[PDB]
Protein backbone atom coordinates (compact mmCIF):
# COMPACT_ATOMS: atom_id res chain seq x y z
CA UNK A 1 0.00 0.00 0.00
CA UNK A 2 0.97 3.61 -0.66
CA UNK A 3 -1.69 5.61 1.16
CA UNK A 4 -0.90 9.35 1.27
CA UNK A 5 2.76 8.88 0.37
CA UNK A 6 4.48 11.78 -1.36
CA UNK A 7 7.48 11.16 -3.57
CA UNK A 8 8.34 9.15 -6.66
CA UNK A 9 11.07 6.54 -6.47
CA UNK A 10 12.22 6.51 -10.11
CA UNK A 11 13.74 3.08 -9.50
CA UNK A 12 16.73 4.51 -7.65
CA UNK A 13 18.03 4.19 -4.13
CA UNK A 14 18.17 7.15 -1.76
CA UNK A 15 21.54 8.56 -2.80
CA UNK A 16 21.06 8.04 -6.54
CA UNK A 17 17.61 9.68 -6.54
CA UNK A 18 18.90 12.70 -4.61
CA UNK A 19 21.89 13.03 -6.94
CA UNK A 20 19.46 12.79 -9.86
CA UNK A 21 17.41 15.71 -8.55
CA UNK A 22 20.62 17.68 -7.93
CA UNK A 23 22.12 17.16 -11.36
CA UNK A 24 18.80 18.12 -12.97
CA UNK A 25 18.64 21.26 -10.84
CA UNK A 26 22.12 22.09 -12.10
CA UNK A 27 21.19 21.59 -15.75
CA UNK A 28 17.93 23.52 -15.41
CA UNK A 29 19.31 26.62 -13.69
CA UNK A 30 22.19 26.41 -16.16
CA UNK A 31 20.24 26.28 -19.43
CA UNK A 32 16.85 27.58 -18.30
CA UNK A 33 15.13 24.75 -20.19
CA UNK A 34 15.80 21.01 -20.26
CA UNK A 35 14.03 18.07 -21.88
CA UNK A 36 13.59 14.93 -19.80
CA UNK A 37 10.99 12.25 -19.12
CA UNK A 38 7.58 13.33 -17.91
CA UNK A 39 7.83 11.84 -14.38
CA UNK A 40 11.31 13.27 -13.76
CA UNK A 41 10.15 16.70 -14.92
CA UNK A 42 7.18 16.70 -12.55
CA UNK A 43 9.50 15.95 -9.60
CA UNK A 44 12.14 18.53 -10.53
CA UNK A 45 9.56 21.35 -10.29
CA UNK A 46 9.38 21.44 -6.51
CA UNK A 47 13.01 20.53 -5.96
CA UNK A 48 14.08 23.50 -8.08
CA UNK A 49 11.26 25.85 -7.04
CA UNK A 50 12.46 25.61 -3.43
CA UNK A 51 16.02 26.50 -4.44
CA UNK A 52 14.87 29.58 -6.34
CA UNK A 53 12.76 30.62 -3.34
CA UNK A 54 15.80 30.50 -1.06
CA UNK A 55 17.59 32.63 -3.64
CA UNK A 56 14.71 35.12 -3.50
CA UNK A 57 15.59 35.37 0.20
CA UNK A 58 19.18 36.29 -0.63
CA UNK A 59 20.68 35.88 2.85
CA UNK A 60 23.99 34.13 3.49
CA UNK A 61 22.29 31.20 5.25
CA UNK A 62 20.02 30.71 2.24
CA UNK A 63 23.05 30.70 -0.06
CA UNK A 64 24.84 28.17 2.15
CA UNK A 65 21.66 26.07 2.07
CA UNK A 66 21.46 26.19 -1.72
CA UNK A 67 25.11 25.22 -2.07
CA UNK A 68 24.47 21.88 -0.35
CA UNK A 69 22.60 20.81 -3.51
CA UNK A 70 24.09 22.92 -6.30
CA UNK A 71 27.72 23.12 -5.08
CA UNK A 72 28.73 25.59 -7.85
CA UNK A 73 29.29 29.09 -6.46
CA UNK A 74 29.32 30.42 -10.02
CA UNK A 75 25.98 28.77 -10.71
CA UNK A 76 24.72 29.81 -7.28
CA UNK A 77 25.83 33.35 -8.12
CA UNK A 78 23.87 33.11 -11.37
CA UNK A 79 20.87 31.99 -9.33
CA UNK A 80 21.17 34.74 -6.74
CA UNK A 81 21.96 37.64 -9.11
CA UNK A 82 20.10 36.90 -12.36
CA UNK A 83 17.45 34.20 -11.90
CA UNK A 84 16.10 35.11 -8.46
CA UNK A 85 15.56 38.85 -9.24
CA UNK A 86 13.03 37.92 -11.95
CA UNK A 87 10.73 36.33 -9.33
CA UNK A 88 10.63 38.92 -6.52
CA UNK A 89 6.87 39.36 -6.88
CA UNK A 90 5.98 35.90 -8.20
CA UNK A 91 4.56 33.73 -5.39
CA UNK A 92 5.94 30.31 -6.16
CA UNK A 93 5.64 28.33 -9.34
CA UNK A 94 8.86 29.51 -10.97
CA UNK A 95 8.96 26.36 -13.10
CA UNK A 96 6.74 24.84 -15.77
CA UNK A 97 6.34 21.44 -17.41
CA UNK A 98 4.97 20.96 -20.92
CA UNK A 99 4.60 17.52 -22.43
CA UNK A 100 6.17 16.87 -25.82
CA UNK A 101 4.46 14.86 -28.57
CA UNK A 102 6.99 12.28 -29.72
CA UNK A 103 8.49 9.41 -27.75
CA UNK A 104 12.07 8.20 -27.52
CA UNK A 105 12.74 5.70 -30.30
CA UNK A 106 14.81 3.33 -28.19
CA UNK A 107 12.45 2.83 -25.27
CA UNK A 108 9.24 4.77 -25.95
CA UNK A 109 9.72 7.18 -23.07
CA UNK A 110 7.23 10.06 -23.00
CA UNK A 111 9.22 13.28 -22.79
CA UNK A 112 8.57 16.78 -21.51
CA UNK A 113 10.48 20.01 -21.15
CA UNK A 114 11.07 21.76 -17.83
CA UNK A 115 11.89 25.45 -17.87
CA UNK A 116 12.05 28.54 -15.72
CA UNK A 117 9.17 30.98 -15.98
CA UNK A 118 9.38 34.57 -17.26
CA UNK B 1 -8.10 -58.61 28.85
CA UNK B 2 -10.67 -56.11 30.18
CA UNK B 3 -8.02 -54.38 32.30
CA UNK B 4 -5.50 -54.50 29.42
CA UNK B 5 -5.15 -51.90 26.65
CA UNK B 6 -3.29 -52.72 23.44
CA UNK B 7 -1.79 -49.87 21.37
CA UNK B 8 -0.58 -50.36 17.80
CA UNK B 9 1.63 -47.91 15.96
CA UNK B 10 4.41 -47.62 13.42
CA UNK B 11 7.71 -49.19 14.44
CA UNK B 12 11.25 -47.76 14.47
CA UNK B 13 14.37 -48.24 12.43
CA UNK B 14 14.83 -50.10 9.17
CA UNK B 15 12.28 -51.47 6.77
CA UNK B 16 11.88 -49.07 3.84
CA UNK B 17 8.33 -48.61 2.57
CA UNK B 18 7.10 -51.30 4.94
CA UNK B 19 8.31 -49.81 8.21
CA UNK B 20 6.95 -46.46 7.05
CA UNK B 21 3.32 -47.56 6.75
CA UNK B 22 2.79 -50.63 8.95
CA UNK B 23 1.27 -50.67 12.43
CA UNK B 24 3.60 -53.45 13.48
CA UNK B 25 4.63 -52.02 16.85
CA UNK B 26 2.57 -53.07 19.88
CA UNK B 27 2.16 -51.61 23.34
CA UNK B 28 0.29 -53.49 26.07
CA UNK B 29 -0.79 -51.76 29.28
CA UNK B 30 -2.01 -53.42 32.46
CA UNK B 31 -4.41 -50.62 33.31
CA UNK B 32 -4.62 -51.04 37.13
CA UNK B 33 -0.85 -51.24 37.67
CA UNK B 34 0.21 -49.19 34.65
CA UNK B 35 3.15 -51.47 33.84
CA UNK B 36 3.55 -51.87 30.09
CA UNK B 37 5.46 -53.94 27.56
CA UNK B 38 6.33 -52.87 24.03
CA UNK B 39 7.45 -55.09 21.19
CA UNK B 40 8.45 -54.65 17.56
CA UNK B 41 10.74 -57.67 17.31
CA UNK B 42 8.98 -58.94 14.17
CA UNK B 43 7.22 -57.27 11.28
CA UNK B 44 3.87 -58.82 12.32
CA UNK B 45 1.53 -56.92 14.63
CA UNK B 46 0.15 -60.34 15.57
CA UNK B 47 3.40 -62.04 16.50
CA UNK B 48 4.34 -58.84 18.35
CA UNK B 49 1.03 -58.57 20.20
CA UNK B 50 1.50 -62.19 21.22
CA UNK B 51 5.06 -61.75 22.47
CA UNK B 52 4.04 -58.59 24.33
CA UNK B 53 1.08 -60.18 26.12
CA UNK B 54 3.21 -63.17 27.05
CA UNK B 55 5.76 -60.81 28.62
CA UNK B 56 3.13 -58.71 30.36
CA UNK B 57 1.82 -61.84 32.08
CA UNK B 58 5.27 -63.18 32.96
CA UNK B 59 6.09 -59.80 34.49
CA UNK B 60 2.79 -59.46 36.37
CA UNK B 61 3.25 -63.03 37.57
CA UNK B 62 6.65 -62.22 39.07
CA UNK B 63 5.24 -59.11 40.76
CA UNK B 64 2.51 -61.32 42.22
CA UNK B 65 4.95 -64.08 43.22
CA UNK B 66 7.10 -61.42 44.92
CA UNK B 67 4.48 -59.68 47.07
CA UNK B 68 3.63 -63.16 48.36
CA UNK B 69 7.30 -63.79 49.21
CA UNK B 70 7.33 -60.60 51.27
CA UNK B 71 4.21 -61.88 53.06
CA UNK C 1 2.83 -9.14 29.34
CA UNK C 2 4.09 -12.25 31.04
CA UNK C 3 4.01 -15.68 29.45
CA UNK C 4 5.56 -19.13 30.00
CA UNK C 5 9.39 -18.86 30.13
CA UNK C 6 9.13 -15.26 31.38
CA UNK C 7 11.31 -14.61 34.44
CA UNK C 8 9.96 -12.47 37.28
CA UNK C 9 11.61 -10.94 40.32
CA UNK C 10 10.02 -11.82 43.65
CA UNK C 11 8.86 -8.78 45.65
CA UNK C 12 8.44 -10.52 49.01
CA UNK C 13 10.59 -12.06 51.75
CA UNK C 14 9.68 -15.70 51.12
CA UNK C 15 13.26 -16.37 50.09
CA UNK C 16 12.38 -16.59 46.41
CA UNK C 17 14.48 -14.38 44.15
CA UNK C 18 13.42 -15.37 40.60
CA UNK C 19 10.35 -17.31 39.47
CA UNK C 20 9.89 -18.42 35.86
CA UNK C 21 6.31 -18.33 34.63
CA UNK C 22 4.97 -21.68 33.44
CA UNK C 23 1.20 -20.94 33.18
CA UNK C 24 -1.10 -17.90 33.01
CA UNK C 25 -4.01 -18.81 35.31
CA UNK C 26 -6.60 -16.95 33.27
CA UNK C 27 -9.13 -19.16 31.60
CA UNK C 28 -8.38 -21.92 29.10
CA UNK C 29 -5.58 -20.33 27.05
CA UNK C 30 -4.67 -16.78 28.04
CA UNK C 31 -1.53 -15.73 26.19
CA UNK C 32 -0.28 -13.10 28.65
CA UNK C 33 -0.47 -12.18 32.32
CA UNK C 34 -0.59 -8.58 33.48
CA UNK C 35 -0.86 -6.89 36.88
CA UNK C 36 -3.36 -8.65 39.14
CA UNK C 37 -3.30 -11.97 37.26
CA UNK C 38 -2.19 -15.13 39.02
CA UNK C 39 0.46 -17.30 37.41
CA UNK C 40 2.06 -20.61 38.23
CA UNK C 41 5.85 -20.62 38.30
CA UNK C 42 8.83 -22.69 39.34
CA UNK C 43 11.34 -21.12 41.71
CA UNK C 44 14.53 -20.70 39.69
CA UNK C 45 16.56 -18.73 42.26
CA UNK C 46 16.13 -18.50 46.04
CA UNK C 47 18.13 -17.69 49.17
CA UNK C 48 19.05 -20.17 51.91
CA UNK C 49 16.60 -21.20 54.65
CA UNK C 50 13.65 -19.34 53.10
CA UNK C 51 10.13 -20.74 53.01
CA UNK C 52 10.19 -21.49 49.29
CA UNK C 53 13.18 -23.28 47.77
CA UNK C 54 14.67 -23.65 44.30
CA UNK C 55 12.43 -26.06 42.39
CA UNK C 56 9.03 -25.57 44.05
CA UNK C 57 5.99 -25.08 41.82
CA UNK C 58 4.30 -22.07 43.39
CA UNK C 59 1.58 -19.57 42.56
CA UNK C 60 2.11 -15.82 42.39
CA UNK C 61 0.27 -12.63 41.43
CA UNK C 62 2.00 -10.18 39.12
CA UNK C 63 2.51 -6.82 40.85
CA UNK C 64 4.84 -4.96 38.44
CA UNK C 65 5.25 -5.29 34.68
CA UNK C 66 7.72 -3.77 32.21
CA UNK C 67 5.01 -3.44 29.55
CA UNK C 68 3.00 -0.35 30.39
CA UNK C 69 -0.45 -0.91 31.91
CA UNK C 70 -3.21 1.27 30.45
CA UNK C 71 -6.01 2.83 32.49
CA UNK C 72 -9.52 4.19 31.85
CA UNK C 73 -8.50 7.75 32.72
CA UNK C 74 -6.17 7.64 29.72
CA UNK C 75 -2.91 7.37 31.66
CA UNK C 76 -0.44 4.49 31.77
CA UNK C 77 2.12 3.15 34.22
CA UNK C 78 5.41 1.37 33.57
CA UNK C 79 7.81 -0.40 35.90
CA UNK C 80 11.47 -1.24 35.43
CA UNK C 81 10.95 -4.99 35.92
CA UNK C 82 8.44 -7.81 36.12
CA UNK C 83 7.63 -8.61 39.75
CA UNK C 84 5.30 -11.01 41.54
CA UNK C 85 4.29 -11.80 45.12
CA UNK C 86 4.08 -15.51 45.87
CA UNK C 87 0.66 -16.46 47.25
CA UNK C 88 -1.29 -19.46 48.49
CA UNK C 89 -4.35 -21.10 46.93
CA UNK C 90 -6.59 -18.71 48.88
CA UNK C 91 -4.79 -15.82 47.11
CA UNK C 92 -3.04 -14.51 50.20
CA UNK C 93 0.67 -13.62 50.27
CA UNK C 94 2.97 -16.12 51.92
CA UNK C 95 5.79 -13.80 52.91
CA UNK C 96 5.30 -11.05 55.46
CA UNK C 97 6.62 -8.07 53.49
CA UNK C 98 6.25 -6.71 49.95
CA UNK C 99 9.28 -5.00 48.40
CA UNK C 100 8.91 -2.01 46.10
CA UNK C 101 5.86 -0.38 44.53
CA UNK C 102 2.83 -2.22 43.17
CA UNK C 103 0.13 -1.39 40.66
CA UNK C 104 -3.07 0.11 42.07
CA UNK C 105 -4.84 -2.44 39.86
CA UNK C 106 -4.17 -5.02 42.57
CA UNK C 107 -6.59 -3.19 44.85
CA UNK C 108 -9.58 -3.55 42.49
CA UNK C 109 -8.73 -7.24 42.11
CA UNK C 110 -8.84 -8.53 45.67
CA UNK C 111 -5.20 -8.27 46.77
CA UNK C 112 -5.63 -5.83 49.65
CA UNK C 113 -3.14 -7.52 51.97
CA UNK C 114 -0.53 -7.17 49.22
CA UNK C 115 -1.60 -3.58 48.57
CA UNK C 116 -1.51 -2.99 52.32
CA UNK C 117 2.02 -4.34 52.84
CA UNK C 118 3.46 -2.57 49.79
CA UNK C 119 5.45 0.60 50.57
CA UNK C 120 3.90 2.56 47.71
CA UNK C 121 0.90 1.97 45.45
CA UNK C 122 1.07 3.62 42.02
Amino acid sequence: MRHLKSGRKLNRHSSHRLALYRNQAKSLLTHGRITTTVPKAKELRGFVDHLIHLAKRGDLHARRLVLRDLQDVKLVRKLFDEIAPRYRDRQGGYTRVLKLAERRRGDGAPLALVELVE
Amino acid sequence: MDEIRIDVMRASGPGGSGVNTTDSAVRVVHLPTGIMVTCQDSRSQIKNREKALMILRSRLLEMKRAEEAER
Amino acid sequence: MIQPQTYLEVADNTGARKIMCIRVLKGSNAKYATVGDVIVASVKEAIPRGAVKEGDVVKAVVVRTKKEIKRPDGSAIRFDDNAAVIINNQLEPRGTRVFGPVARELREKGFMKIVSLAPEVL
Partner: protein, 59 residues
Protein backbone atom coordinates in the same frame (compact mmCIF):
# COMPACT_ATOMS: atom_id res chain seq x y z
CA UNK D 1 8.84 -26.91 -8.28
CA UNK D 2 8.35 -29.90 -10.56
CA UNK D 3 8.54 -28.08 -13.90
CA UNK D 4 4.94 -27.47 -15.01
CA UNK D 5 4.46 -28.09 -18.72
CA UNK D 6 1.69 -27.72 -21.30
CA UNK D 7 -0.48 -30.82 -21.25
CA UNK D 8 -1.91 -30.36 -24.75
CA UNK D 9 -1.04 -28.22 -27.72
CA UNK D 10 -3.17 -25.08 -27.71
CA UNK D 11 -5.56 -25.08 -30.67
CA UNK D 12 -5.68 -22.45 -33.38
CA UNK D 13 -9.15 -21.57 -32.13
CA UNK D 14 -7.98 -21.17 -28.56
CA UNK D 15 -4.70 -19.34 -29.02
CA UNK D 16 -6.60 -16.87 -31.18
CA UNK D 17 -9.43 -16.64 -28.67
CA UNK D 18 -6.69 -15.48 -26.29
CA UNK D 19 -5.50 -12.69 -28.60
CA UNK D 20 -9.07 -11.34 -28.81
CA UNK D 21 -7.82 -8.60 -26.43
CA UNK D 22 -4.65 -7.66 -28.32
CA UNK D 23 -5.73 -5.07 -30.88
CA UNK D 24 -4.06 -1.67 -30.71
CA UNK D 25 -6.16 1.37 -30.04
CA UNK D 26 -5.30 4.13 -32.55
CA UNK D 27 -3.61 7.15 -30.97
CA UNK D 28 -5.83 9.91 -29.62
CA UNK D 29 -5.26 12.91 -31.89
CA UNK D 30 -6.70 16.45 -31.89
CA UNK D 31 -6.05 19.27 -34.40
CA UNK D 32 -3.56 21.95 -33.45
CA UNK D 33 -5.44 25.27 -33.43
CA UNK D 34 -2.46 27.11 -34.90
CA UNK D 35 -1.39 25.07 -37.94
CA UNK D 36 -4.33 22.65 -38.26
CA UNK D 37 -1.98 19.64 -38.07
CA UNK D 38 -3.01 16.50 -36.19
CA UNK D 39 -1.27 15.87 -32.89
CA UNK D 40 -1.94 14.19 -29.53
CA UNK D 41 -3.87 16.48 -27.17
CA UNK D 42 -2.09 18.13 -24.26
CA UNK D 43 1.28 18.28 -26.01
CA UNK D 44 3.26 21.04 -27.67
CA UNK D 45 2.61 20.75 -31.40
CA UNK D 46 5.73 19.22 -33.01
CA UNK D 47 4.81 20.90 -36.32
CA UNK D 48 4.55 24.62 -35.57
CA UNK D 49 5.72 24.62 -31.95
CA UNK D 50 2.67 26.28 -30.42
CA UNK D 51 0.91 25.44 -27.17
CA UNK D 52 -1.68 27.39 -25.16
CA UNK D 53 -1.83 29.90 -28.00
CA UNK D 54 1.83 30.95 -27.82
CA UNK D 55 5.05 29.64 -29.33
CA UNK D 56 7.01 27.37 -27.01
CA UNK D 57 9.86 25.89 -29.02
CA UNK D 58 11.66 25.94 -32.36
CA UNK D 59 10.71 23.17 -34.74
Amino acid sequence: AKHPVPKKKTSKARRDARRSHHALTPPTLVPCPECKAMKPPHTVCPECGYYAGRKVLEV
